[PDB]
């Protein structure tokens, strides 16, 4: 069986070559446990790479490109064999073939090489695969090509350390057009690619925003498929980690009522946790951005999550309420208190996460300054919010934080007690 396939690919007869390349392809196209290792050991990989350059025989090109796609879909050691036989520059060249079938297979193959690791991803981009990949993207592009290329594009952006920004910047106009598709697969892969490009410094977020993605990304927060929603939510969340102007791009497109609906629907814990992290990066902004959070009606259900939800959700909801106390106005902080935020912030003071203790302590302190301003202005006998902290059992918790190992938590507790309980 196999010594006839090797002889066929190693023969110089066009029909013998196509017959055994189809046989090798079929053997590599099997469901689970493909004999990729045995196909490599048969010494046929360099012949398939040679069969890629045969532009007078497009059927063999496609069969050889599909067999190499499946070898490149295995282990890193299998992907390296494809790289060592110089397939990467030949697949970039095959993106300019008269055959739609060869172009599509070359796109998949490069996606599989770029998918292996940041090193392999970097080799594909250094071989200039990005521009010709984007060149076969237009209004006459078939759905199968739109899906293969959008998935390859996501692999070009994928991994840590991230690719150079100048290297993935040409992708942004194409990705902004691809998120307008109604195909869930295209949407999933374009959202994944945008979640990678937006994960970083503010100069990256700025370019993502200038491509005009914010209105369509907000709409995608309401996509019924979680496959779309997960990278959509992550992209929105990465954009709002930028400056106030960058964060405003998302808020202007009614994202806050959309983010609220993710907190009130019967959704996965990981989706609610991400919505809370997103909201927290918005309450980390200016007084107008906090107002928009208040206006959307998020504070109420956020305070309930801060009190009743699973620890990972409570963590993000803690950062969201505390951020609002940090940048917020006097009357906004008071609105947070009237929505019942003091008790749940107090209850997380004995929490084993020192970061969360510090966040809730800062939130309670910010609230205390406001309560003090009300006392001074009205010549009152007591700080109303210091009474509420004591009623919520928060006072005894702050007094106990004087025994905490952490200096920052200790020094905070002492500073709070000296300024409000002497």
């Amino acid at each position: 069986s196999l010594p006839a396939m090797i002889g066929g690919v190693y023969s110089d007869d066009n029909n013998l070559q196509l017959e055994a390349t189809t046989q090798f392809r079929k053997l590599l196209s099997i469901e689970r446990s493909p004999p990729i290792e045995e196909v490599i050991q048969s010494g046929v990989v360099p012949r398939f790479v040679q069969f890629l350059t045969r532009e007078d025989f497009p059927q063999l090109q496609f069969e050889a490109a599909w067999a190499l796609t499946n070898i490149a879909s295995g282990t890193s050691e299998n992907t390296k064999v494809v790289i060592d036989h110089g397939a990467v520059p030949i697949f970039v060249k095959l993106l300019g073939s008269s055959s739609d079938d060869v172009r599509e297979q070359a796109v998949w193959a490069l996606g599989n090489v770029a998918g292996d690791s940041p090193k392999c991803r970097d080799l594909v981009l250094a071989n200039g695969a990005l521009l010709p990949l984007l060149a076969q993207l237009n209004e006459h592009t078939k759905l199968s090509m739109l899906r293969n290329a959008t998935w390859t594009l996501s692999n070009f952006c994928r991994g840590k350390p991230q690719p150079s920004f100048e290297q993935t910047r040409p992708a942004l106009p194409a990705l902004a057009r691809l998120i307008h598709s109604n195909d869930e697969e295209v949407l999933t892969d374009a959202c994944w690619a945008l979640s990678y490009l937006s994960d970083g410094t503010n100069d990256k977020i700025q370019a993502v925003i200038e491509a005009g993605v914010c209105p369509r990304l907000v709409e995608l927060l309401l996509h019924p498929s979680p496959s779309v929603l997960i990278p959509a939510l992550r992209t929105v969340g990465n954009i709002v980690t930028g400056d106030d102007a960058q964060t405003q791009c998302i808020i202007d497109h009614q994202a806050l009522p959309c983010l609220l609906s993710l907190l009130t629907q019967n959704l996965k814990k990981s989706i609610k946790k991400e919505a809370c992290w997103t909201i927290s990066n918005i309450t980390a902004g200016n007084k107008d951005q906090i107002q928009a959070v208040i206006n959307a009606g998020i504070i109420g259900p956020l305070v309930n999550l801060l009190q009743t939800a699973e620890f990972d959700i409570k963590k993000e909801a803690a950062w969201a309420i505390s951020n609002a106390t940090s940048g917020g106005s006097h009357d906004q902080i008071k609105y947070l208190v009237s929505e019942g935020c003091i008790k749940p912030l107090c209850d997380l003071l004995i929490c084993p996460d020192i970061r969360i203790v510090t966040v809730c302590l800062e939130g309670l302190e910010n609230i205390l300054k406001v309560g003090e301003t009300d006392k001074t202005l009205a010549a009152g006998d007591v700080n109303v919010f210091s009474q509420m902290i004591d009623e919520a059992e928060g006072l005894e918790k702050i007094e106990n934080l004087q025994s905490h190992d952490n200096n920052e938590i200790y020094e905070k507790a002492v500073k709070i007690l000296e300024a409000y309980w002497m």
Partner: peptide, 21 residues
């Protein structure tokens, strides 16, 4: 404060895809 916090959990699609047909 307040400070903007980047994502601390790794979220990504499928690295490789095998062509079955």
């Amino acid at each position: 404060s307040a400070v903007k916090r980047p994502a601390a959990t790794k979220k990504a699609g499928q690295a490789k895809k095998k062509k079955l047909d």
